[PDB]
Design an enzyme around this catalytic site. Structure first.
Site, PDB file in Angstrom:
ATOM      1  N   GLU B 249      44.009  54.884   6.151  1.00 57.55           N
ATOM      2  CA  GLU B 249      44.882  55.853   5.491  1.00 57.55           C
ATOM      3  C   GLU B 249      43.999  57.067   5.245  1.00 57.55           C
ATOM      4  OE1 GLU B 249      45.528  55.248   1.317  1.00 57.55           O
ATOM      5  OE2 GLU B 249      47.694  55.486   1.522  1.00 57.55           O
ATOM      6  N   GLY B 337      51.191  52.841  -1.907  1.00 53.03           N
ATOM      7  CA  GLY B 337      50.019  53.507  -1.348  1.00 53.03           C
ATOM      8  C   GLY B 337      49.111  52.663  -0.434  1.00 53.03           C
TER       9      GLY B 337
END
Lengths: 431, 430
Positions: B249, B337
């Protein structure tokens, strides 16, 4: 090659079939109607006589069949229930254990239903699998019928697979739904009607709810639908539609009715075009009989059906689930894995909608089902909720602030509670 | 046709650039280092002058840049923070508001980072987008540099896109990472160093921890690493592996070091073979400089990078994230997330999701292994795969509540196992 010779060699009595299960091993079984009553009674009897012990049973969606036999409270010290979902049967045990000096009697195994096949086969391991099956056909195959789920995998991965033949089990076509006799370790026979899902009464609020929900289902929608009075009524409202599809976790009587009516054609699905897809079935005798040899119904394993990525490949998915409570954020709670796979998948589907519905109240209107804050772990996280519906309307929560969420959710609550909830929101600083 | 002509035509001052943004509209900006300081200072000034109002700003990962400009408390009524993660900056605003008379001053928008592009473009709607970019190249393209995420998407969906050219922003290759000049509405120039993540020092536990983790990283692993000293140091024990991949990410310094060292070849990845994939980057000046024109690094949007189905495509994914607490069931809590990679790594063939934390805090006085998390969690217990502390690792998948609690109590520091064991008995986790 001689299938009648293999059948006769393997065919036995329930008592003899379960007699060789090792103590201290792992057993699993089909879900719900798939649970084999004769095999399970005999196994329970083995514990009653003190002849088996330390047997862990890993399973989902238990029915009166398992609860009445192996799962009976008295055998809990010998047949250890390792439930991966908690239903009415385990709740009853859980309460009994609490009253008995906070004794622990259910060994909940947290898991994702979509991962059940891998969890049972790989991390946990299943030594013996037992499942009710349809009668052997002229090529030597039995059908798992009502069950696909994790059963089609574990029937194969287990070191022994024991089948219970029952002519009331429909012969269902599906992926790995058919099992050849060469893959079965023992066969017993017990022709008795399948256990039924109780038919529940429609409360008045479901009428307005089903109409609000129905406005949100477009043509070509690909339905996933849970069980209960609410989804059945919804199916009732959709009878005038055309060219709908089915890709559902559980196949239920409401959905089957749309199949029977020609409402579901599956011609607009991207995957499994032409077929109603499900992972396990629950309903009543009329529905069970209808599945038998139906060429436009196709069961598939759960790691396929409940894979959110797979779900999203169909355009216009509509997922309709019920819940018990919605809080002001609003996370939803269905208790007091399945559902969540479809909330995600439906939202991801192009033109897709996930709908979660509940009447705004309970207890003759004395208790609000719209509440300040859910107590403990939730069913549907607030980041995943898409559309919620009560008898007072519908809200799409995606992209709304905490304040916008709280305000709009309160307006779906019964008027009797809006003032009380508004106060709570200011105290919680949702505003 | 003439880029030099288009550029001079669109080049202006921060003041004039932001002068046209309509009151009552929705604005968003790049993440972290991408937040444009010159443009945001100029926007904050309009609010100070009283020349703009009712402007909602939707964003993730605030940086001191926005913290010190549009987000300053005195402007809260005019520039309304619509935060999609809550970090140190919002906490401070929120705490101050409580002191300012139980006043609500931060609006939180619950969401999935990987849905950010759709939530922002379609559900929320964004009218003006602002992002720092690398200098225009000789074909007329800027680069989003350290940012792709949802930035790539909203730069196109906004009615107006305003860029801040900065020579310190690396020119990065990626999906939609390059933006043509004809797609840009206005340009300002501000050449200043990029914001750095603070470097943090290791505590002793990271040494045992990194070893336990390293031992779980198989040959040809495809890495995602979470920001922080712990993940940074595990990178260090991997200086010796070969043929690792990156699909992360956040691209951080530890990961970039493995790239610099030739440890990362990306040759064993199924997707993006040969290229290191990230969705936005944070680090220090050395790392930012290193990204410039690198042909084996490739940014992609967050709805690709953080799609668990995509993560799973690569074999032998290892996701290493840190957390603040693990309970006896054991869910994890990261806030005072990443769930996408917990899901994706487990789905990868040979994949492992690892969540790690030291067993104690406050000089050994507070246990980070606790009975039950207070409130909403980060990683739910049905999703946790491997949890690690300095006392070892456990794979929770398939374990019962009792099996979970017993192995987890043994990962707590010895000072606490009895106190924890007794709580578990009382909760009937037994």
């Amino acid at each position: 090659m001689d299938i009648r010779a293999l059948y006769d060699e393997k065919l036995t009595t329930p008592e003899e079939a379960v007699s060789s299960i090792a103590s201290g091993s792992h057993l699993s079984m089909g879900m719900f109607a798939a649970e084999p009553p004769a095999l399970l009674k005999a196994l329970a009897d083995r514990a009653t006589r003190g002849d088996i012990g330390d047997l862990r049973v890993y399973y989902f969606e238990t029915a009166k069949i398992a609860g009445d036999t192996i799962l009976r409270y008295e055998l809990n010290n010998r047949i250890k229930p390792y439930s991966m979902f908690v239903t009415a049967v385990e709740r009853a045990l859980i309460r009994r254990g609490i009253e008995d000096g906070g004794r622990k009697v259910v060994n909940y195994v947290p898991s994702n239903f979509h991962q059940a096949p891998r969890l049972l086969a790989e991390e946990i391991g299943i030594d013996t699998f037992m499942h009710t099956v349809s009668p052997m056909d002229c090529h030597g195959y039995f059908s798992l019928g009502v069950g696909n789920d994790y059963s089609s995998r574990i029937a194969r991965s287990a070191r022994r697979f024991i089948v219970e033949v029952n002519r009331y089990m429909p012969r269902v076509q599906g992926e790995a739904a058919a099992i050849h006799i060469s893959e079965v370790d023992a066969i017993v026979e017990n022709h008795v009607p399948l256990i039924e899902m109780p038919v529940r009464s429609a409360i008045p609020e479901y009428t307005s709810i089903s109409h609000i929900i129905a406005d949100l289902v477009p043509d070509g929608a690909c339905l996933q639908m849970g069980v209960g009075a609410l989804p059945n009524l919804v199916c009732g409202v959709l009878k005038d539609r055309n060219d709908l599809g089915i890709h559902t976790e559980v196949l239920n009587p409401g959905l089957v009715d749309l199949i029977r009516r020609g409402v579901v054609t599956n011609q607009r699905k991207t995957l499994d075009r032409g077929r109603s897809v499900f992972t396990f079935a629950m309903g009543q005798q009329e529905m069970y009989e209808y599945l038998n040899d139906h060429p436009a119904i196709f069961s598939r394993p759960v790691d396929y059906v409940n894979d959110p990525h797979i779900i999203a490949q169909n355009d216009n998915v509509v997922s309709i689930n019920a819940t018990l409570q919605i809080d002001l954020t609003g996370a939803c709670n269905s208790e007091h894995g399945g559902q969540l796979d479809f909330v995600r998948g439906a939202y991801a589907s192009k033109g897709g909608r996930s709908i979660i519905a509940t009447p705004s109240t309970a207890a003759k209107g004395t208790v609000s089902r719209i509440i300040p804050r859910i107590d403990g772990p939730v069913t549907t996280p607030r980041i995943d909720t898409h559309y919620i519906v009560t008898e007072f309307g519908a809200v799409n929560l995606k992209g709304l602030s905490s304040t916008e969420r709280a305000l709009r959710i309160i307006e779906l609550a019964h008027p009797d509670f809006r003032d009380e909830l508004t106060q709570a929101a200011k105290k919680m600083h949702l505003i």
